């Protein structure tokens, strides 16, 4: 596979992505590392399709409502940012006030 | 011209006046001071104040500071105050106004050339946390402390050996030199305990002359009168700190004794509300006394409704008993009580206990020491309401008092309140940078001797720092020489007299304890409550001046499930 | 498209031009295989391989350099040698020479 | 005997005439020489030439290489050609015939019982990378570039740190003290530069004397006039390079002022697009002048689909700017033009630009120097088809051209190319060795000091080291005292005279930065153009002596989605 | 009192008589020997023994020992006996009876108020494995290694480059001292050895006086009578072993060619059975022969169903061979032989082969040289009953025959037995802790140098060691200076004498091998047999005194699926 | 569970096989790291659930088709070794040519 550091670290964030998934699966309301976790990861398959930037600086804030995460966790993220290799290689997808 | 206070608030951070709230607790802080001349204020970026001929100066490197935090809200002991931080040479060297004197007017701390800048504003900024009851099980624990906002780990240990997983006691010469060596690779400063359980002086002084900064006497190791009389004869010879963990089973006597034979020589009492260890059931009556330095333990801080059932089975695996044993059983129940669990809380709230420690892997939580002392603090406010000596519509008191526990207090007890413990000019530039919401959990920053050592750190390989995944990373300070150059090993006066650091060769600075047989219970900051405390025998009752202390079991707590992923 | 693929021109590569080569009848009498590399000392090779020694001396296999040729027990077969060149000096081997020629 | 060509390159490697594309690019590139001779080629493996007596010989360790790279196919500035590369005290020792001369003919590098074999058929070789952008936000930054291909590492930080998320400088003595220290620990060559915005000469020449190879003059210290003016003064009498980043607001003048301020004195350009910054809209003019090394830094390469959308809120978090401030965003349509974007690809094919950066962690991606150098290759031959300056039936020429931006042109620029820089004998050992199927996307082996550092590693328990998972793991290259042994720390001529390495106990090995102030873009090799640009003010529009340059975004790109795993 | 027998075990561990199944094998222990006093046992905890002025006494750290490690089962090759192990200045100060001179009968270790604890009541204590057929392939190796129990590593590499994959061999003085150098980064004890390949004894020498304490022979580099023979002639003249690995393709002779070169002087036999390396397909005849020291590399050990298969495709990648060309793979079949596979696990048993190693990476697992040892005697009981030197319903005497091979049988063949190799008193404190449902498999312990280095730690902020998740981590005996004080690099005599330590300013403690060249056959513990062992050149069976030597394939094995995730 | 290093570095490969597996099901093909990722976690099942090297040799050859990954993979990977416990211990599986 040969794995550089970075592609490891996604591993990371895929894995805290899976967390979330089945919390919010059960029916629990997310937390801050959850929601962000959640968030991000819907971004990277997004990316791996070939979505465009602006189409998931758009999805991206669609993921999760208000309803979905716990008191006071949607101003605790004012935004959320995350990268991964597009067709046309890596870029920066930032989700502004991604909780509503 | 003029700006409303919030686009100020937003621009420059809070304000006299502004109220912010910590983290998710009901604790709110109000700005009681700003030292700054509004619209002089320095802010860093493009088009911004400090630029050559602007906010920074022209002054050589040894008239100006090395590192500027700008706008930062302080948090500490003796206020909450906005102003602006100056580090030079690793150490505090100015609290004040920040800027270029050619210039701007009232300038104390000067921005050149050769000064880095942290953008402080928004920002609550606090002294490195203490914790003086560390288990040193394993070096990880180093990370975890240090990632929770305490930069100094005082304790002993060799390692995961049974020794060590009952006591903080790093046994003898041997082991106190290996370990003095280990230390310089961990990013935090450190002194050593030895095991003070010996009735043969001699024992005792070696270890000091080796290194050690304090004795540990252990139940484990036998905290009988002899043993006590001794650590303590070599304490005051040599001004090192004696910790207590004294006889549960009551086998040498009772808590009376043990006190008769301390002889009123200052001495700090570990978990003193006893769950962690103590004559059983009333150690917790040592805070009464002028010589005693109590602190408490982080698993039974603040009482909770999972507590006690949690307590039972923990009470076993660390002090190496077997439930099927009767002996080894029965004072399980005898040793952890719901009445000194909530009366403790209570305590703290009032000043009687003055420390707060984690009793690592040993019956506390390493990254847990100041988590817990805020919820503590949210809870004795929810159920007491405001402090006697609160002024204002704030909890600006309270919040003094707490913090001192973790900070100062501890500092002052294990003598090292001259090197770090707050914010104080000549102290370590041991700091830690928090965003509001996130006080007491997960800082922005840690800086140790001056240079940031860890903090959160997002995609390696991204355009900017903030993408995901962010998670904490050692940073600069935690590095080789740069870390032995901003940590410091704290020694005893002998054995920085004999050598030991140039017989160890010993690269990290070096740092020497004074002042542990002077400090008592009046020198605590803001905890120097001397109750008329008596606990029933049997009912196990906690009384001050025969009114009943106690308090309620929290369902749920702030700091908790809103901040973690597990 | 194959990443990093080659385009190799079609045609052969002439090995060792310009030097001796000589031709030795070789029989394995041994009773276990033997296989000799590219660039041993053919002169030098298991005893158990019969052939004119005297006229493989200085000499190894004409083959592609990092080959071997394989012997079975009791294998006969025809092999091409190519003269050793430098200073023409052998060392090693089973140390019959150690020196120049 | 005779063989087949086919059957040849899989045994060797390819040969003269053979062509190979490089990773999934459109690029070819063709063997110019052969510098074996055939049926004479070393092999290493049971029963191959590598053996006592045979392809080795009986020379002491004094008359034959530590190490041997076998079948190599070089990629330098210099030429594409198949040999066998010979490594000795760390250093290029020769390029040539393999062997021992005992027995075989025209052998120019002597293999002994003291060497060691790295099988390079069918591999590529190059020189490390060397990336002169460097913001020192975190130390794992190291190992990323590491991991790419780059060996030495040039910018300025001192962590986490407001100024050095904005800019490269370290600021003052201490700090720089400091992170000299810290570099040590890190597996790659490192120089410093300092804080370069000041109108006093001795504020600049204390850092130099510190220890900085460089000064960066960054708009948010202020790049006003006396500051460049200053810096450049300091740099002539000290033999330094200076990094600008000019005045995007034309608060002080446009680009006309500051390149009257700069007065023909040597410079690099960082950023010389504009995007990363700089006058708005004309900073990419300076290319035009022969004191002049501009460079690139790499989001903007190449021209893609999602380039200016991810461009807008990137330049944000960087500057530390606010969206809700009208004039935080008003520049930013003025910093990130679609016209100089396009324009910058076909100027760096044209060798108008001369060097590829990263910016990493400030709008800019530390891995990705080699990869995206690569790519904007590609989408140049795709869209403007083969340079003027080709011969034959491939890419060597362009190939040439963009490994030198790398390569030996930020070498030259920093004054380090007499130690590092390209394959050629007397420079440090830096290589890299690739499989063509992964050029310029994941290294199969990088060799620092002549020891491998970082190489992809398989199951650590498994029988071979092939087995999964494979990902990069730190080698001996990068341990303690060897990995000090294998890498650089750079100095300035004053620091090595005065005794900064070792009044800081430096343990690498140092160089001294030189011919800082001579080197001008007639000194780029194979990018030396000074075309007659000119931007209009309005349009934006890029053009050369009339000409419109432009080029057309990629929506999919070579060495990208096929490669990585996120 | 009384005490029944089974309560006893619970408290203290076996006693003289019980017995204890190792792991999920069927292999038993009895304890033969136990040398407490009943009722005078020393236990460590609250209100137990090891208490001042109790089983704790008042002498000073000279006349104490540092730990102590209690009620210990001990396994050696010389006993196993129960019994408390006192260890001081990081060696094995003795065997005996722990406690207090002042009030408890026959104490031989004095336990004092320097003296750490480590309960080993229900475990079972090892000396330090120690793998002689080591390739540095990559560092991480050495954690690997380390967590499986083996505390010792010897063998040669650069890292990873062909020659490495290949053969163990730290090619010359540059490519030695840059290993040496790295080597103090590691937390096991560590020799190199150098390419033995050289028909010139100067160039040798020249490798030994650079620090390699052994020399290898790989048929990749050319193992003919001359190299043979001239790497003989140095070692003894310089006091350092010979590894072998001959000449598989028979080109410059038959086994009895390369055994006649030999000529009686000492040698170590990689891999004797041939799978990994050797003469086809007689190699195995070596272990015949008094002045040959044979050892067994991992992958082969024990024989079951999937090892033939596994076999033909890892022969391959290791040598560098290539599946197309008919003479890469025509040995192949030659070289992996059922009918020797077989025999080698019987001549195991027997003692005809006298060690078991890994051949890390290159044919072998670098973490399972303990375990498959184990599963060998497993199987060997399984197959052939009780050893004609069985006394006793019990495996004590295979076990001993057996743990030898990994202990002191590899520790005399290197010459470094003086240091470790077993407990005995004044041997280096490298020991390791088991749990009888884990030995052999996961350790719960791994001491180096009197400090542990590594052990199974749970989460880290948990109240206890114990909470999940639990896996291995580095403790304080793997840290900096503290690793370098706990672990040897061992040097041969030249080197030591010539002053390369300090040369290269190497940091650990040196040790210096000898006795190298006086090891014979007859000298391996409980592994000496020379049997007339013959191999048919065409059926590849294995005879001994004309009788067939065989064994069937296993198709489960303990210490497999039960312990591991994957 | 005292997991070792081998165990936790095993566990790495284990997710990273999770996300091909994922992007697979969504129909996309596959890349080089998805690939052998998706095909290594087949074999280690392969072998806890006992099946022999000889059996997993065959089996792992027809977990992804040419038809399932994008241009190029299949050549990228001539082959695809992993080691796993099986009943018998520790073994190596080596599948030549996975991707036809
Ligand atoms: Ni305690
Ligand atoms: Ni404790
Ligand atoms: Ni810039
Ligand atoms: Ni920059
Ligand atoms: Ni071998
Ligand atoms: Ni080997």
Known sequence: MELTPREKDKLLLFTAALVAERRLARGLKLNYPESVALISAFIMEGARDGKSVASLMEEGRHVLTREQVMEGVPEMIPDIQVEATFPDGSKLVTVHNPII | ?566 | ?101
């Open chain 2, 1 to 566: 011209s003029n700006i409303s206070r919030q686009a100020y608030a937003d621009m420059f951070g809070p304000t006299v006046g502004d109220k912010v709230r910590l983290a998710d607790t009901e604790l709110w802080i109000e700005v009681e001071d700003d030292l700054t001349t509004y619209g002089e204020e320095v802010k860093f970026g493009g088009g911004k104040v400090i630029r050559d001929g602007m906010g920074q100066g022209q002054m050589l490197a040894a008239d100006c500071v090395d590192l500027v935090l700008t706008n930062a809200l302080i948090v500490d002991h003796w206020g909450i105050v906005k102003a602006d931080i100056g580090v030079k040479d690793g150490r505090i060297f100015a609290i004040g106004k920040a800027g270029n004197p050619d210039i701007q007017p009232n300038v104390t701390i000067p921005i050149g050339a050769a000064t880095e800048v942290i953008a402080a504003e928004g920002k609550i900024v606090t002294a490195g946390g203490i914790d003086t009851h560390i288990h040193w099980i394993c070096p990880q624990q180093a990370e975890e402390a240090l990632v929770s906002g305490v930069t100094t780990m005082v304790g002993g240990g060799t390692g995961p050996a049974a020794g060590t997983h009952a006591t903080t006691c790093t046994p003898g010469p041997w082991y106190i030199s290996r370990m003095l060596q280990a230390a310089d690779s961990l990013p935090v400063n450190i002194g050593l305990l030895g095991k003070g359980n010996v009735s043969q002086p001699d024992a005792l002084r070696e270890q000091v002359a080796a290194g050690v900064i304090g004795l540990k006497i252990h139940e484990d190791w036998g905290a009988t009168p002899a043993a006590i009389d001794c650590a303590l004869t070599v304490a005051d010879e040599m001004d090192i700190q004696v910790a207590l963990h004294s006889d549960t089973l009551n086998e040498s006597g009772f808590v009376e004794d043990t006190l008769a034979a301390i002889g009123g020589r200052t001495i700090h009492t570990f978990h003193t509300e006893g769950a962690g260890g103590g004559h059983a059931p009333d150690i917790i009556t040592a805070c009464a006394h002028p010589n005693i330095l109590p602190s408490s333990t982080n698993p039974t801080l603040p009482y909770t409704l999972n507590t006690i059932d949690e307590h039972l089975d923990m009470l076993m695996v660390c002090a190496h008993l077997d439930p099927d044993i009767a002996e080894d059983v029965a004072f399980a129940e005898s040793r952890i009580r719901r009445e000194t669990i909530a009366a403790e809380d209570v305590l703290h709230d009032l000043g009687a206990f003055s420390l707060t420690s984690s009793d690592s892997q040993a019956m506390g939580r390493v990254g847990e020491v100041i988590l817990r002392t805020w919820q503590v603090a949210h809870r004795m406010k929810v159920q007491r309401g405001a402090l006697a000596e609160e002024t204002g519509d704030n909890d600006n008191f309270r919040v003094k008092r707490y913090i001192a526990k973790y900070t100062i207090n501890p500092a002052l007890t294990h003598g090292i309140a001259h090197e770090v413990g707050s914010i104080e000019v000549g102290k370590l530039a041991d700091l830690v940078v928090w965003s509001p919401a996130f006080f007491g959990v997960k800082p922005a920053t840690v800086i140790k001797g001056g240079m940031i050592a860890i903090a959160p750190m997002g995609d390696i390989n991204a355009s900017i720092p903030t993408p995901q995944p962010v998670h904490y990373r050692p940073m600069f300070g935690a590095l080789g020489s740069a870390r032995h150059h901003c940590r410091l090993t704290f020694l005893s006066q002998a054995a920085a007299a004999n050598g030991v650091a140039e017989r160890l060769n010993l690269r990290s600075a070096i740092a020497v304890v004074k002042g542990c047989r002077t400090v008592q219970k009046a020198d605590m900051v803001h905890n120097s409550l001397q109750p008329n405390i008596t606990v029933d025998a049997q009912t196990y009752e906690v009384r001050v001046d025969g009114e009943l202390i106690t308090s309620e079991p929290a369902d749920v707590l702030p700091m908790a499930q809103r901040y973690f992923l597990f």
């Open chain 3, 1 to 101: 498209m194959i990443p990093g693929e080659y385009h190799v021109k079609p045609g052969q590569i002439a090995l060792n031009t310009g030097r001796a080569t000589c031709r030795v009848v070789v029989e394995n009498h041994g009773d276990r295989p033997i296989q000799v590399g590219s660039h041993y000392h053919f002169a030098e090779v298991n005893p158990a391989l019969k052939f004119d020694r005297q006229q493989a001396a200085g000499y190894r296999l004409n083959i592609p350099a990092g080959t071997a040729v394989r012997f079975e027990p009791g294998q006969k077969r025809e092999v091409e040698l190519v003269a050793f060149a430098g200073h023409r000096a052998v060392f090693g081997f089973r140390g019959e020479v150690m020196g120049p020629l």
